[PDB]
Write a protein that holds these residues in place. Structure first.
Motif, short mmCIF file in Angstrom:
data_model
loop_
_atom_site.label_atom_id
_atom_site.label_comp_id
_atom_site.label_asym_id
_atom_site.label_seq_id
_atom_site.Cartn_x
_atom_site.Cartn_y
_atom_site.Cartn_z
N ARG A 1 0.80 -1.22 0.00
CA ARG A 1 0.00 0.00 0.00
C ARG A 1 0.84 1.27 0.00
NH1 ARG A 1 -3.90 0.16 2.81
NH2 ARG A 1 -3.94 2.35 3.50
N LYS B 1 0.57 1.37 -5.74
CA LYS B 1 -0.83 1.71 -5.48
C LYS B 1 -1.77 1.25 -6.59
CE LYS B 1 1.61 4.51 -4.36
NZ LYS B 1 3.05 4.45 -3.99
N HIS B 2 -1.27 0.48 -7.55
CA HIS B 2 -2.09 -0.02 -8.64
C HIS B 2 -2.74 -1.37 -8.32
CE1 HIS B 2 -0.43 3.02 -11.49
NE2 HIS B 2 0.62 2.92 -10.69
N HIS B 3 -2.68 -1.81 -7.07
CA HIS B 3 -3.26 -3.08 -6.67
C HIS B 3 -4.74 -2.90 -6.34
CE1 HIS B 3 -1.88 -1.26 -2.85
NE2 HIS B 3 -2.95 -1.85 -2.35
N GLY B 4 -5.38 -3.96 -5.87
CA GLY B 4 -6.78 -3.90 -5.51
C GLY B 4 -7.02 -4.12 -4.03
N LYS B 5 -7.33 -3.04 -3.31
CA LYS B 5 -7.57 -3.15 -1.88
C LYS B 5 -8.96 -3.73 -1.62
CE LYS B 5 -6.72 -2.76 2.45
NZ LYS B 5 -6.57 -1.41 3.07
N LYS C 1 -10.60 -3.33 1.43
CA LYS C 1 -11.27 -2.67 2.58
C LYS C 1 -11.74 -3.70 3.60
CE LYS C 1 -10.80 1.56 1.22
NZ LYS C 1 -12.00 2.35 0.85
N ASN D 1 -12.25 -0.61 6.67
CA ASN D 1 -12.30 0.79 6.30
C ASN D 1 -13.24 1.02 5.12
N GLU E 1 -9.86 -2.71 15.78
CA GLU E 1 -9.03 -1.58 16.16
C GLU E 1 -8.30 -1.80 17.47
OE1 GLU E 1 -12.10 -1.43 15.08
OE2 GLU E 1 -11.89 -0.37 13.17
N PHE F 1 -2.72 3.79 12.47
CA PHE F 1 -3.49 5.03 12.42
C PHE F 1 -3.96 5.23 10.98
CE2 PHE F 1 -0.78 6.66 16.17
CZ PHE F 1 -1.56 5.93 17.05
N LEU F 2 -5.15 4.73 10.68
CA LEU F 2 -5.73 4.87 9.35
C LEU F 2 -6.38 6.23 9.17
CD1 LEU F 2 -7.33 1.32 8.86
CD2 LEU F 2 -5.12 2.16 8.04
#
Lengths: 213, 309, 48, 314
Positions: A108, A112-116, A118, A121, A123, A212-213
């Motif tokens: 990440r 940044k061209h990958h597929g997150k 979530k 988002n 704890e 810390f997101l």
């Protein structure tokens, strides 16, 4: 405090910094209602150092030798403002994220061209709270090239900050000594002074933590 | 009490129904617009309980009620843009029924961030597991079930409460010139109270919550028949903002009072041990009742004992 | 079972050597007990 | 609301909507400035849209759950005495105006994939009962989206942080978003501006200002540029004159400089970790070039307008 031996050696050190109006003559005898006002600012920077005999006549002496740029802190939390080399100040910053992040969820901050997915988002998990995670040397060889601006050639003086920092007590070893096929290391000091150095060479580490997101 | 109020549950309200329902007429064959429950209770308050047994499509259609107080539904090329100043009296319910101490404060509720951001004040019922909590609430239940229509000891009947509802909407209070400096210094306190960790935390307080605090101080002096606002009325709602996420209350108003007095004396005398009555001068000015002279006389020596020990 | 030699001031995983009985009965006999501290020990942390 | 100067710049440029011309030879390329707003819930994003709808001449406002694929642009018959009559939605009646759509991220999946026809040719071909008829609907889509679940996270890309499809993102132009955070170096103007407008916008204060002509309690608020603002009658007679008078054409100045400049970023974006710039940012430079020239009343495009348009798209 509770022991009587601590107040015995502490009350003597406060005598030279309390008997000032007595020697000058501006305060007569029998006056315990007017000496607490002038001594109040003189105790706010000394009551927070309990069980420490280091506070003596050498704490304020370091401020006298700092006539040029008083930004350096020597004496009161001197570890926050220390002298670090150019390519060595980024070692403690980059190794801090390699001991509290998974070995897989690291793409990440690079590609940044990958597929997150979530995930959320969760704890209050044990992440970033159990301690430094064991990391080898493959992580350090792929993160120092992104923090610096221009390219850096890993010569002999580049890997010298790995073993020299062991004596300086900045990183711990995974128990016994390893061989040579990529040893593992951990961490030691948290982010108590990392933010002070980052604000001097224009750097921000708060936006790089995974917890810390 | 208030006739301009509704009552519904979670599953009783679908996607529409309470906002603006649209259905083709049977004896005219034309798309009409039917008002809901939020349009009939104009300038009032709508009640809703059990915020768990509901889907997600109903919360989206009501997001324009607590922030804009209007209804803008254009369905089928039929314009129906209205407005309603109805407050939402929601009542959130925990996931497992009770507040779990192991989980976080954001893991026990189903409300997200966009829902709580558009909402104003948010209170939490205080739960106490002491032997004095159940001992005092049980006495009120006995006096109610045994003495029928005899336990009520109100000083003002319900006939005069409804009369004082129209006098508040007559003389609109203003803003004094000595209150603009007090609001700009209290928002920075909650700004640091919000960021407990570094930046974000739990409840977000920004511009949507700051404009609601000004309305609390404006409506605080609404019942006291006061024109200009006073600093003693804005600090009343300031305490509720701190206890929003939760005989000890007596000891709280004492510490917060002596701190605002011992910071202006230019000189210093004895007033330590031999002059214990000097601290009673700045407090007897606000005393103007009856029992605060003999009963509270032996209480002053007990609160001052905290510093002595 | 193990005390790490390289452990700092963050990794301890320690526990307690007391019990949930004598800790509550040792509050009324302690000299000088503040009012804002004793109430926090009896309650199960319900406020912030 | 004080602050966010970059957000107010995009709202004024989108009011003009550009001049939809025919740059091709057989294809009709649309020329409308579409701005997509999406911020952290808590900074009042819908209040910024309620101001442009009152200072213009034609503007509507709808929600997400209040409409669908039926109440959009066109949808059956007149079951009374065997008749057939087609209807319309909300985008057809809002010709040459500014449309405001609220709650766009919570829209259904079957509705987001059906709105692309209206925002590509400004026309719809209704083929019902064997009768076709083409019309014209000039609209500027202005939506306000929200992040998925909780709050907005700057650590993720904007194309993945919002629950929206990918073909609809590549149809706007201005994607200026903001993130609110605790800043002690600028929190003294937010609490000071909300208390100054609370008294100016009070109904009791309007008795000596709006009702009583020739008197005012508070003057103008200190802006961030030292320029006096505008009342109300100035914005009314502004869009009904400049938009229907001077028609800027297409010249041929130093437009070849942008050709070789585009290649500098095309072979540098993937050098660290970013997507390259597509052809959308090339054909869109004419939109903001004629929008600023209409303010200063310029018959032709000038180099001073194409320079201030690059800093907005970047």
């Amino acid at each position: 405090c509770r022991d009587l031996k601590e107040l015995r050696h502490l009350a003597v050190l406060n005598f030279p910094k309390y008997c000032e109006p007595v020697v000058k003559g501006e305060a007569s005898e029998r006056d315990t209602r007017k000496l607490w006002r002038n001594i109040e600012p003189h105790l706010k920077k000394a009551m927070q150092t309990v069980y420490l005999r280091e506070i003596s006549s050498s704490q304020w002496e370091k401020l006298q030798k700092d006539d040029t740029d008083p930004g350096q802190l020597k004496g009161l939390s001197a570890h926050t403002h220390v002298e670090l080399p150019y390519y060595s100040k980024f070692i403690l910053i980059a190794a801090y994220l390699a001991s509290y992040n998974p070995a897989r969820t690291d793409k990440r901050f690079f590609l940044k061209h990958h597929g997150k997915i979530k995930k959320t988002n969760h704890e209050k998990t044990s992440n970033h709270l159990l301690g430094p995670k064991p990391f080898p040397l493959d992580r350090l060889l792929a993160i120092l090239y992104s923090i610096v601006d221009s390219r850096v050639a890993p010569t002999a003086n580049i890997f010298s900050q790995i073993t020299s920092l062991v004596t300086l007590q900045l990183l711990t070893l995974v128990g016994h000594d390893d061989q040579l096929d990529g040893p593992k290391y951990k961490c030691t000091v948290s982010l108590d002074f990392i933010r002070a150095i980052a604000r001097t060479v224009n750097f921000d580490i708060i936006k790089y933590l995974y917890d810390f997101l | 009490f208030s006739p301009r109020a509704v009552y519904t549950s979670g599953k009783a309200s679908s996607a529409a129904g309470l906002t603006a329902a649209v259905v083709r007429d049977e004896e005219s064959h034309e798309f009409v617009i039917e008002a809901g429950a939020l349009m009939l209770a104009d300038n009032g308050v709508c009640c809703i309980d059990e915020f768990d047994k509901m889907d997600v499509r109903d919360q989206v259609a009501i997001h324009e009620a607590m922030e804009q107080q209007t209804i803008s539904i254009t369905k089928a090329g039929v314009k129906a843009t209205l407005n309603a100043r109805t407050s939402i009296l929601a009542a959130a319910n925990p996931i497992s029924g009770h507040y779990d101490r192991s989980k976080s404060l954001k893991q026990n509720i189903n409300l997200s961030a966009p829902i709580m951001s558009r909402f104003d004040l948010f209170f939490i019922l205080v739960d106490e597991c002491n032997e004095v909590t159940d001992y005092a609430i049980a006495r009120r239940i006995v006096d109610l079930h045994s003495r029928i229509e005899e336990s009520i000891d109100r000083v003002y009947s319900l006939d005069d409460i409804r009369r004082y509802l129209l006098f508040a909407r007559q003389f609109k209070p203003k803003i004094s010139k000595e209150s603009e400096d007090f609001i700009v210094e209290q928002y920075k306190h909650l700004r640091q109270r919000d960021g407990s960790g570094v930046t974000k935390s739990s409840w977000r307080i920004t511009v949507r919550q700051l404009e609601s605090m000004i309305r609390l101080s404006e409506a605080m002096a609404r019942m006291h028949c006061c024109d200009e606002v006073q600093p003693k009325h804005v600090k009343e709602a300031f305490r509720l903002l701190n206890k929003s996420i939760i005989y000890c209350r007596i000891s709280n108003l004492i510490v917060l009072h002596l701190r605002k007095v011992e910071e202006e004396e230019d000189e210093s005398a004895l007033k330590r041990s031999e002059l214990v009555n000097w601290y009673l001068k700045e407090i007897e000015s606000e005393i103007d009742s009856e029992e605060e002279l003999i009963n509270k006389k032996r209480i002053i020596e007990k609160v001052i004992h905290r510093l002595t020990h | 079972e193990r005390t790490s030699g390289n452990s700092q001031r963050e990794y301890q995983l320690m526990k307690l050597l007391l019990d949930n009985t004598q800790i509550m009965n040792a509050l009324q006999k302690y000299p000088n007990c503040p009012t804002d501290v004793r109430q926090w020990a009896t309650s199960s942390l319900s406020w912030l | 609301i004080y602050g966010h100067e970059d957000i107010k710049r995009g709202l004024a440029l989108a009011l003009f909507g550009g001049e939809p011309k025919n740059p091709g030879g057989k294809h009709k390329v649309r020329g409308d400035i579409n701005v997509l707003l999406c911020g952290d819930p808590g900074t009042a994003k819908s209040q910024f849209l309620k101001y442009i709808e009152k200072v213009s001449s034609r503007a509507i406002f709808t929600t997400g759950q209040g409409a669908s694929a039926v109440g959009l642009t066109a949808y059956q018959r007149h079951p009374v005495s065997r008749e057939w009559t087609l209807e319309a939605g909300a985008l057809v009646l809002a010709d040459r105006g500014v449309c405001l759509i609220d709650e766009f991220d919570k829209m259904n999946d079957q509705d987001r994939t059906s709105i692309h026809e209206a925002m590509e040719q400004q026309s719809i071909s209704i083929s019902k009962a064997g009768i076709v008829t083409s019309l014209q609907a000039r609209c500027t889509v202005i939506a306000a989206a929200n992040p998925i679940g909780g709050r907005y996270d700057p650590s993720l890309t904007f194309s993945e942080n919002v629950d929206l499809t990918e073909p609809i993102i590549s149809r706007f132009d201005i994607l200026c978003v903001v993130r609110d955070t605790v800043d002690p170096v600028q929190d003294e103007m937010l609490a000071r501006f909300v208390v100054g407008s609370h008294v100016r916008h009070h109904p009791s204060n309007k008795e000596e200002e709006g009702l009583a002509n020739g008197s005012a309690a508070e003057p103008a608020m200190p802006n961030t540029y030292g320029v006096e603002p505008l009342p109300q009658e100035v914005l009314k007679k502004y869009i009904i004159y400049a938009k229907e008078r001077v028609h800027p054409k297409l010249n041929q100045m130093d437009q070849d400089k942008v050709a070789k400049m585009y290649s500098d970023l095309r072979k540098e974006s993937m050098a660290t970790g970013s997507i390259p710039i597509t052809v959308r940012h090339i054909e869109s430079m004419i939109r903001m070039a004629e929008a600023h020239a209409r303010i200063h009343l310029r018959d032709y495009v000038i180099e001073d307008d194409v320079n201030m348009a690059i800093r907005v798209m970047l």
